[PDB]
Amino acid sequence: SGAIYVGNYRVVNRHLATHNDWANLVWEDSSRDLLVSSTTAQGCDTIARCDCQTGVYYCSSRRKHYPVSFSKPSLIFVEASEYYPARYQSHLMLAVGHSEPGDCGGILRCQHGVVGIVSTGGNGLVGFADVRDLLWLDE
Ligand SMILES: NC(=O)[C@H]1CCCN(C(=O)Cc2cc(F)c(F)cc2Br)C1
Ligand SMILES: [Zn+2]
């Protein structure tokens, strides 16, 4: 679990969005596993606007942060789960690092701010949904 809070927006994995997220929906994209909802309180986070390919992510299944080298956002095949059919997920970045079910929502950050959130994983890989291209989160 986990979310990004920026301005009057909350960014979560679409497959973990709550009834309240959907009742306050701003934007969602199943192909990216992202959903953004509106908030009344001002958020704690800032978003990176960069092309970094190294950073640090939070891994809830180890209660620890790990450094990672990650690929640029791209279209990657993701196997079927109880949440989605087998499909290509867009704007996804892969890295070698631990992850297991329950780790979605952990934040990935570089020196410039928040880069994205854990969205996929398996066999010593971890995948992150990028948020750096969502320029409207800042206004
Ligand atoms: N973005 C998606 O389609 C997600 C939806 C939830 C399920 N998805 C996962 O990848 C879960 C997962 C499985 C593992 F074996 C692992 F090591 C780490 C994770 Br996270 C795809
Ligand atoms: Zn950066």
Core attributes:
binds the ligand NC(=O)[C@H]1CCCN(C(=O)Cc2cc(F)c(F)cc2Br)C1, monomer, 4-stranded antiparallel sheet, binds zinc ion, 1 helix, 2 domains, mainly beta, 139 residues, 11 strands
Give the number of DSSP strands. 11
Largest sheet: 7 strands, antiparallel
User: How do the SSEs run, as a string of H and E?
Assistant: EEHEEEEEEEEE
Rg measurement, Å: 14 Å
Looking at the structure, what is the overall shape?
globular
Number of domains: 2
Strand portion, in percent?
over 45%
Structure ligands = ligand A1B4B, zinc ion
Tally of alpha and pi helices: 1
Helicity range: under 10%
- What is the end-to-end distance? 26 Å
Which strand order do you get reading across the main beta sheet? 6-5-9-10-11-8-7
**Assembly type:** monomer
Structural class: mainly beta
Protein name: Protease 2A
Subunit structure: Homodimer.
Catalytic activity: Selective cleavage of Tyr-|-Gly bond in the picornavirus polyprotein
Binding site for Zn(2+) 1: 50, 52, 110, 112
Word description of this protein:
The chain is mainly beta. It folds into 2 domains: 3-44, no CATH class; 45-139, no CATH class. The protein contains 1 helix and 11 strands; from the N terminus they run E-E-H-E-E-E-E-E-E-E-E-E. The strands form 2 sheets. The chain has a 7-stranded antiparallel beta sheet, with no helix packed on it. A 4-stranded antiparallel beta sheet has the order 1-2-4-3. A hairpin with a 4-residue loop joins strand 5 (54-59) and strand 6 (64-69). The chain binds the ligand NC(=O)[C@H]1CCCN(C(=O)Cc2cc(F)c(F)cc2Br)C1 and zinc ion. Zinc ion (ZN) binds at residues 48, 50, 52, 110-112. Residues 15, 33, 78, 81, 83-84, 89, 99-101, 103-104, 119-122 line the site of ligand A1B4B. Zn(2+) 1 binds at residues 50, 52, 110, 112. The active site is at 15 (for protease 2a activity), 33 (for protease 2a activity), 104 (for protease 2a activity). It comes from Coxsackievirus A16 (strain G-10). This is Protease 2A.
